[PDB]
Amino acid sequence: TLNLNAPTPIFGGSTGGLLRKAEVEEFYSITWTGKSETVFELPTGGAAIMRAGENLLRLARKEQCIALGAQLKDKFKITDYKIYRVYPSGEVQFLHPKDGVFPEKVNPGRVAVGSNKRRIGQNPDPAKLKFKGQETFDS
Amino acid sequence: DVAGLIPCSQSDAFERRLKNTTQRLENRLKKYEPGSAPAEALQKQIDKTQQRFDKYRNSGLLCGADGLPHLITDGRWSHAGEFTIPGLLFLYIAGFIGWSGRSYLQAVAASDNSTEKEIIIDIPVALQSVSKGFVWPLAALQEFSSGKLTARDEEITISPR
Amino acid sequence: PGDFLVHHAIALGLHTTTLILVKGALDARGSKLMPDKKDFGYSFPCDGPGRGGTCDISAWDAFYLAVFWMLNTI
Amino acid sequence: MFLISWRGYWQELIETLVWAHERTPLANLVRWKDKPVALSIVQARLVGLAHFAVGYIVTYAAFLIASTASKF
Amino acid sequence: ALYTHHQYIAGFLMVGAFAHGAIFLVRDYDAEQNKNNVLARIIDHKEAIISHLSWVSLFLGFHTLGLYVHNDVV
Amino acid sequence: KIVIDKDPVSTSFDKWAVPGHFSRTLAKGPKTTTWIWNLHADVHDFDSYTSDLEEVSRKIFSAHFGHLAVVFIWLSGAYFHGARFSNYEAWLSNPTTIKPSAQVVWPIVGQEILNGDVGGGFQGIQITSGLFQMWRASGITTELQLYVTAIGALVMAALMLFAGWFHYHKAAPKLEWFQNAESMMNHHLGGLFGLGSLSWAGHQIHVSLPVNKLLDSGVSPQEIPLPHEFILNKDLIAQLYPSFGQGLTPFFTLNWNEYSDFLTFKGGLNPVTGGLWLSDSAHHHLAIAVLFIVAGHMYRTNWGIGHSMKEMYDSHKGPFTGEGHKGVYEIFTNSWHAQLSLNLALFGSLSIIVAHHMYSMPPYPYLATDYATSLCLFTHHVWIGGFLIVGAGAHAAIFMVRDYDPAQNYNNLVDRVLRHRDAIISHLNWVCIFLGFHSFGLYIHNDTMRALGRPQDMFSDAAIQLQPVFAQWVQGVNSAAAGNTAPNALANASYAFGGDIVSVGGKVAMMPISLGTADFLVHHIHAFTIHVTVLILLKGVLFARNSRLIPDKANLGFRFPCDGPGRGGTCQVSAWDHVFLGLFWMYNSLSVVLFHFSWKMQSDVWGNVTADGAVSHITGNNFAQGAITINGWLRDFLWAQASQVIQSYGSALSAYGLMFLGAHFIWAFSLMFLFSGRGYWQELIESIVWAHNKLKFAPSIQPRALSITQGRAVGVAHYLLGGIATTWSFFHARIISVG
Amino acid sequence: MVQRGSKVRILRKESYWYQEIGTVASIDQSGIKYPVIVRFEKVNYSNVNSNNFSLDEVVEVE
Amino acid sequence: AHTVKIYDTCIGCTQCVRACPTDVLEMVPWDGCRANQIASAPRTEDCVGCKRCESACPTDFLSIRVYLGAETTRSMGLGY
Numbered sequence A: 001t002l003n004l005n006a007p008t009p010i011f012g013g014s015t016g017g018l019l020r021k022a023e024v025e026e027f028y029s030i031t032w033t034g035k036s037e038t039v040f041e042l043p044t045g046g047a048a049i050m051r052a053g054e055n056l057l058r059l060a061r062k063e064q065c066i067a068l069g070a071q072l073k074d075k076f077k078i079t080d081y082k083i084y085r086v087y088p089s090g091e092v093q094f095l096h097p098k099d100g101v102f103p104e105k106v107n108p109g110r111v112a113v114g115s116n117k118r119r120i121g122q123n124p125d126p127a128k129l130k131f132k133g134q135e136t137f138d139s
Numbered sequence B: 001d002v003a004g005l006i007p008c009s010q011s012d013a014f015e016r017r018l019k020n021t022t023q024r025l026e027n028r029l030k031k032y033e034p035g036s037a038p039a040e041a042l043q044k045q046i047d048k049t050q051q052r053f054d055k056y057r058n059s060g061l062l063c064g065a066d067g068l069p070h071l072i073t074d075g076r077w078s079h080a081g082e083f084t085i086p087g088l089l090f091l092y093i094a095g096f097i098g099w100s101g102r103s104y105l106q107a108v109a110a111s112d113n114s115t116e117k118e119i120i121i122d123i124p125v126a127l128q129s130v131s132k133g134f135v136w137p138l139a140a141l142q143e144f145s146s147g148k149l150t151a152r153d154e155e156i157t158i159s160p161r
Numbered sequence C: 001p002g003d004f005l006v007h008h009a010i011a012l013g014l015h016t017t018t019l020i021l022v023k024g025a026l027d028a029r030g031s032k033l034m035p036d037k038k039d040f041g042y043s044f045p046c047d048g049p050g051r052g053g054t055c056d057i058s059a060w061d062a063f064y065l066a067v068f069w070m071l072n073t074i
Numbered sequence D: 001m002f003l004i005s006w007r008g009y010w011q012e013l014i015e016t017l018v019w020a021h022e023r024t025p026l027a028n029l030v031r032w033k034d035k036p037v038a039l040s041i042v043q044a045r046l047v048g049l050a051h052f053a054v055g056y057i058v059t060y061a062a063f064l065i066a067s068t069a070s071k072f
Numbered sequence E: 001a002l003y004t005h006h007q008y009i010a011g012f013l014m015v016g017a018f019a020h021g022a023i024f025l026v027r028d029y030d031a032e033q034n035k036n037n038v039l040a041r042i043i044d045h046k047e048a049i050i051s052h053l054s055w056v057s058l059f060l061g062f063h064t065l066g067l068y069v070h071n072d073v074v
Numbered sequence F: 001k002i003v004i005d006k007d008p009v010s011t012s013f014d015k016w017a018v019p020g021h022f023s024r025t026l027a028k029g030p031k032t033t034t035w036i037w038n039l040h041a042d043v044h045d046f047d048s049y050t051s052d053l054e055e056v057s058r059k060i061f062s063a064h065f066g067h068l069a070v071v072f073i074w075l076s077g078a079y080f081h082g083a084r085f086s087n088y089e090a091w092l093s094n095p096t097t098i099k100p101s102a103q104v105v106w107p108i109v110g111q112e113i114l115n116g117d118v119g120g121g122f123q124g125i126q127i128t129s130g131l132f133q134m135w136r137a138s139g140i141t142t143e144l145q146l147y148v149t150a151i152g153a154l155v156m157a158a159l160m161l162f163a164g165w166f167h168y169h170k171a172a173p174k175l176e177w178f179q180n181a182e183s184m185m186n187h188h189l190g191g192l193f194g195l196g197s198l199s200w201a202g203h204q205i206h207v208s209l210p211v212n213k214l215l216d217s218g219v220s221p222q223e224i225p226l227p228h229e230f231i232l233n234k235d236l237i238a239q240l241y242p243s244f245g246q247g248l249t250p251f252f253t254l255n256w257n258e259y260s261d262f263l264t265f266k267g268g269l270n271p272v273t274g275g276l277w278l279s280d281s282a283h284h285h286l287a288i289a290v291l292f293i294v295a296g297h298m299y300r301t302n303w304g305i306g307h308s309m310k311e312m313y314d315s316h317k318g319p320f321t322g323e324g325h326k327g328v329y330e331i332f333t334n335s336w337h338a339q340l341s342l343n344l345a346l347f348g349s350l351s352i353i354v355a356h357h358m359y360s361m362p363p364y365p366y367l368a369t370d371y372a373t374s375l376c377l378f379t380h381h382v383w384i385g386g387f388l389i390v391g392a393g394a395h396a397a398i399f400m401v402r403d404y405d406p407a408q409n410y411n412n413l414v415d416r417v418l419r420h421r422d423a424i425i426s427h428l429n430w431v432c433i434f435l436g437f438h439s440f441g442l443y444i445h446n447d448t449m450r451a452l453g454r455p456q457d458m459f460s461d462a463a464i465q466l467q468p469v470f471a472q473w474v475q476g477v478n479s480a481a482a483g484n485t486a487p488n489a490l491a492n493a494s495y496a497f498g499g500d501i502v503s504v505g506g507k508v509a510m511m512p513i514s515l516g517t518a519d520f521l522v523h524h525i526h527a528f529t530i531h532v533t534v535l536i537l538l539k540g541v542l543f544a545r546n547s548r549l550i551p552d553k554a555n556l557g558f559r560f561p562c563d564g565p566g567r568g569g570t571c572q573v574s575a576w577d578h579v580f581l582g583l584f585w586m587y588n589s590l591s592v593v594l595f596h597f598s599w600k601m602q603s604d605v606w607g608n609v610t611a612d613g614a615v616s617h618i619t620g621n622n623f624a625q626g627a628i629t630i631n632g633w634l635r636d637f638l639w640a641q642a643s644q645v646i647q648s649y650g651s652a653l654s655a656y657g658l659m660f661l662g663a664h665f666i667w668a669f670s671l672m673f674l675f676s677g678r679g680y681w682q683e684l685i686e687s688i689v690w691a692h693n694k695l696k697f698a699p700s701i702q703p704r705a706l707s708i709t710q711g712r713a714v715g716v717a718h719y720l721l722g723g724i725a726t727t728w729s730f731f732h733a734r735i736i737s738v739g
Numbered sequence G: 001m002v003q004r005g006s007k008v009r010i011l012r013k014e015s016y017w018y019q020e021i022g023t024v025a026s027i028d029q030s031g032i033k034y035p036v037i038v039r040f041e042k043v044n045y046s047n048v049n050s051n052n053f054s055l056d057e058v059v060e061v062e
Numbered sequence H: 001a002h003t004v005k006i007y008d009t010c011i012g013c014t015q016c017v018r019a020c021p022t023d024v025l026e027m028v029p030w031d032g033c034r035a036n037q038i039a040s041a042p043r044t045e046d047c048v049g050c051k052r053c054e055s056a057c058p059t060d061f062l063s064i065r066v067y068l069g070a071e072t073t074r075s076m077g078l079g080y
């Protein structure tokens, strides 16, 4: 659940962020709780301020909501962040952490999508799938 | 008389260089003092062109219609000093540079840590390694017949196919 | 004498131009820097900054360098 | 230009041009149907080499013909 | 004009010949139907051929360029 | 306060056997061959390994002393070769005909034609560095004085190198001493810059001014008295400009107008020598002395008074700037890279001003009419000047990745520049393209209307005129200032704005450089290529931390080759590649500035003047109707004026013709690296290290390809070396022949 | 059977170290596939020295 | 979108998962020993093809491989 509107950090700036794509297709958002009043470099320019919060910030893409968390957790020791991807104009809320736990850690119940049960020289040759719709690297 | 060149001891072509070398420098020497320090740099200079030309008149060089000694490598023994004898002088020194690092990189790679020993050039190994490189026209002949010069093609790393 | 040197330059050019094309072709299916090259086809950008760097690793890129040599030879 | 300067430089520059377009009145009104992006890595090699090759010929063709047509 | 035109084309064709050849090696060459024939026996020792081809380019270039520069200074 | 650590590191030759002892990963040994290139890049990259802000500074304070030494070694090399291997003593007898010659060649395998008939009784290479006119200005008459300077420099060369040992290996200062910028500006303005020109005023009045006023009369180099004799003898000096009989007593009753004879405001060219009146430069450096000394009592120290810079930046903030310069003082005490970038920009930009102010106000006697030298100090300092600005763009970007802190810099000016960085770049992007169309496209218009035979349609003086009215009003008001707004000046600031011509010998020292339609057309090309070189360099600094494309470019470092072929491709996203890219554009920016300068002088300004009174210039006023098209730029400048560099064979210029081919070679070699990539040249090692494994002698350090950045860096380093040394050889073997 | 401390050759043809000598480090004596940890004298492109191989992928040059 | 395949040579080191800038990969429980883990690509529609992942696999020849495929707005990283 997004809780829009959650109070954005007090910013005022940035020509570089959330332009006309966000008002036709698929903008993003990230939620976390700031445990001080510390300052951080945005992916747009640098500062916002972390509130007590309820701290939400409509970023541009997926890569900026992932690279913010790898900057948040190292500098400010906060591993509570909860990214999104929006309602009507977007696709799936709560894109990370998809399991509730961080998917760099291992967890029971996940699916092994995109596993090839071989080695890569053990892939078939593209001389062998001539005019055949089977993908060379696919099981 | 192999590619249409006179042996240029008789040529009017090689000799029409000598006058306009020595007339260019005498006209560079005319306005000097005869007891100056550049003057011996312009009297000995024409002598440096004089020892050169009287080394070329005697060696049997084939000079064309230009006056330039051209070289003939089909190698006959009549023109063997042009390329062939500086060829054998090249190859004997080239294997000395060839076998020295070849005998070094066999002698440091057969040690503990040769990755350092490419940085440090070990005189306990390098003077030991040119001692193997001095018998290089004899050592490699008994290294190929004993097979320890090359290796079989499953020792050498093969890129995939 | 002039014709001698140039004739060896063209030979130098003909040998170097075929070299680039043959190395590209004979290593097209794979090399140590990219063992599975054949799985990506004739033309792909590269393989990222990993393994030291792989820019201009495709056979297409190999042909591309040899083109420069072709203009030079002719 | 295409052979020495590579994609990243241009793609980041293009983004500032996209930004500028979207924020300038009397231009905002119109929109591209295809989003602008920098040429690909392989494309640039091809476009650069093609320019390099056409220039090579047209320089030599212009020179060869003109040089002989005055002196023969 | 007649010599240059046809000579530049010839250089393009030959480089192009190796280009479509490299596409064959990545998309059509099957090693599982090419075992010990003239083709597959060559690319067996693929690293040998390229290494020798590399030398000839190096050999030709170093000396021919060397003579021109030698001539140039004198 | 001066606080010191005493001998933190002693004198050991033991660490000399371990290369990479400064670092961590390289004090273990090489496993590939790139470890050599991994080493030799980040040697003098001092914060790459060191974390200690105090210890990283002590290395820099030491290494500057060593760089102070190597100039002094190089200075003595000029001063030593000026005595033994020069025709300097002969050149003071006759400054007009004999060319300045040093670097005599040894009599060996054919380079002894480079010791050509230069003049005097001498044989050597004609040099163009202007040390002869810098020693004639300094007052040097005998050749002994050039010798004792060299040892006098060599002892200072040794004293500087010992001082770098003394201040790191013996007495290392601390960071609270380093951070005292206000006391540092007080001394560097006071001691270095105040007493710099005062001491040179102390030289030039008592030493240079007598013996250079005599050589304008030109009695003899031998019959001029020695420079110490003008302090001993009170009567000998006061023969000329006789105020020394009054002594220091007008200077000490504030009746300073009694020195209206040597400390003056003449302000022209000395018409016998073509240089600036050394009386004026004595009054110049005296006014520079008092201006810089009172500039140095400004900042705060341990005596209460002064301006403190942390107080000045705060309360310099306005409504369009938020916090203003809050924290910007805290940057320049906490980051060497932020200091080096600003120190570099105004150091290169300073030297381009030196190149401009030296050909239009020639400071030296017989440097103006010697066209071999008056060109070559323009184009050298311009060339140095562009390389430092690219270095200013580099370390500005290095500040952004590694030293910039958004914690301290909230809502201040680095914050508000980064928070509008698209509006900067995209308006800069527009004015780049606007300038390229309306400057370079005015040549392509001018190319076609001459090709189509329509000279009524081109942009010329006898055509659609593009008149530089602002540069003609500025050239007007500066040429009509001696007497209206600068009354005490006799003639103007220069003869480049307006006025009569001046001749020395039979050659023109200076004449008014005129600006017409062809000069408007080239000055906007300069404005175009400078704005692009800004645009490459500015984008590298601003997007150094992040962009829209990559949000963590700050994590990947300053110098990383790409982020891979993702997002369509991210090849050259790093700030280092922007500095790599701007290097060719600075090569393009400056080489057209030189092509503007070296052609405008030969056709319009330099030349031989009749004894009737008119001037026939060298390339013959072709810059008006020839310089407006590229074909005129190609024929009448590049093709025509290179006729002497490729016909240099068999003469004493024949080393230049080899380099003019030799730099054409290296420039071609650089194309191999820029046009290629790594993953081709790596797999050619795999077939070749197969062959070196084949004969059982393979190196344990296994070879790899060069890194992509090193492939990029060697591609630009050979490009510039191939491109500038072509221009170095072209400019030499042109102006030595026709000047 | 291959034990620790043995010199091998490489039949993994998709590798950099293919048909080169490796001095192994350990065998994982449980059922996890590719257990032969083979250290090498030479380092690869991405700076690793050791790799998991199969027991069907290592030889006994000894 | 790009195709991301994970081969059976994975040693469950987790380096790859922590390298992806758009969180395309995750570690999942392996059944061949029920103690180690293998990487998986459940969100290949977000793979930009940066190849940061392959630069993190320690094994001599990749356990995770990125084969560039159909390009899309998401994969091109467009904020516009």
Ligand code: CLA
Pocket (backbone or CB within 6 Å): C042, C043, C060, C063, D046, D050, D054, E012, E013, E015, E016, E017, E019, E020, E023
């Ligand atoms: C004569 C026989 C022949 C045939 C039937 C083909 C056919 C093909 N080639 Mg091959 N090839 C050939 C000769 C041939 N080529 C030659 C002579 C070369 C060397 C130049 C090549 C090198 C080559 C490579 C490296 C590749 C192909 C590819 C292809 C395929 C797609 C081409 C394409 O659409 O890319 C796009 C086509 C272009 C970009 C061509 C436009 C370039 C223009 C003509 C340049 C002219 C400059 C400018 C427009 C001039 C303006 C005027 C100026 C004078 C002022 C197609 C199967 C590709 C493939 O993948 O095959 C499966 C591929 O990668 N070709």
Ligand code: CLA
Pocket (backbone or CB within 6 Å): F040, F041, F042, F043, F044, F045, F046, F344, F387, F388, F390, F391, F392, F394, F395, F398, F558, F559, F576, F579, F580, F717, F721
């Ligand atoms: C004002 C003086 C100054 C100082 C103290 C520095 C200091 C530094 N620079 Mg900066 N910079 C400067 C000016 C300066 N620079 C200028 C003038 C330029 C424009 C070229 C730059 C552009 C620049 C770039 C692009 C980079 C640096 C980097 C660095 C850092 C490491 C450099 C190193 O260790 O190289 C060691 C020395 C070498 C590698 C020498 C190799 C040869 C060079 C490349 C060319 C020499 C050509 C030669 C003179 C021509 C004759 C040829 C003949 C010898 C055959 C170090 C902090 C690097 C960095 O990463 O900072 C964090 C970096 O990437 N600088």
Ligand code: CLA
Pocket (backbone or CB within 6 Å): F137, F138, F192, F193, F194, F196, F197, F200, F204, F276, F278, F281, F284, F285, F288, F350, F353, F354, F357, F358, F363, F364
């Ligand atoms: C204030 C600026 C300034 C200017 C214009 C001059 C001008 C001159 N100097 Mg002098 N000098 C100065 C200060 C200056 N000096 C200082 C501060 C020192 C101590 C480092 C010296 C030490 C010195 C020596 C040892 C010698 C000279 C000589 C000369 C003459 C030769 C040409 C030249 O140097 O290029 C002109 C240089 C510039 C145009 C750049 C000025 C650089 C300073 C640092 C600028 C300071 C900034 C200033 C406040 C604002 C101006 C900004 C910009 C417009 C420059 C010329 C009259 C030579 C001579 O005697 O000739 C007969 C000579 O041998 N100077």
Ligand code: CLA
Pocket (backbone or CB within 6 Å): D001, D004, D005, F429, F430, F432, F433, F434, F435, F436, F437, F440, F441, F444, F532, F535, F536, F581, F582, F584, F585
């Ligand atoms: C001579 C070759 C050449 C040319 C023409 C260009 C052109 C350009 N460069 Mg490039 N560059 C070059 C070499 C060249 N570069 C090289 C070798 C490098 C490697 C170092 C680069 C690296 C580089 C970088 C790093 C950058 C540029 C940028 C630019 C653009 C600058 C803005 C501008 O002037 O727009 C106006 C365009 C022109 C002046 C081009 C000529 C157009 C003519 C005069 C008018 C057209 C006539 C007619 C209407 C054409 C169509 C006819 C037809 C339809 C019938 C411009 C397109 C910059 C940029 O993109 O800034 C926005 C930039 O940042 N270049």
Ligand SMILES: CC1=C(/C=C/C(C)=C/C=C/C(C)=C/C=C/C=C(C)/C=C/C=C(C)/C=C/C2=C(C)CCCC2(C)C)C(C)(C)CCC1
Pocket (backbone or CB within 6 Å): C022, C025, E017, E018, E020, E021, E022, E024
């Ligand atoms: C002159 C004469 C003669 C001689 C003749 C001869 C003997 C010749 C030779 C010639 C020859 C001997 C030829 C050759 C050429 C060849 C070429 C033309 C090449 C090409 C090739 C290719 C192209 C290849 C490629 C590839 C690869 C590598 C892989 C797979 C695929 C392919 C196949 C593509 C006689 C005696 C009669 C007499 C007189 C005259």
Ligand code: SF4
Pocket (backbone or CB within 6 Å): C045, C046, C047, C048, C049, C053, C054, C055, C056, D041, F561, F562, F563, F564, F565, F569, F570, F571, F572, F677, F708
């Ligand atoms: S080095 Fe450049 S071209 Fe090669 S993969 Fe990386 S970004 Fe692409």
Ligand code: SF4
Pocket (backbone or CB within 6 Å): H006, H009, H010, H011, H012, H013, H014, H015, H016, H017, H037, H038, H039, H056, H057, H058, H059, H062, H063, H064
């Ligand atoms: S894919 Fe690579 S990084 Fe990920 S677990 Fe397997 S070996 Fe480790």
Ligand code: SF4
Pocket (backbone or CB within 6 Å): F566, H004, H019, H020, H021, H022, H023, H024, H025, H046, H047, H048, H049, H050, H051, H052, H053, H054, H066
């Ligand atoms: S290619 Fe890049 S974005 Fe895709 S999974 Fe690998 S590291 Fe992540």
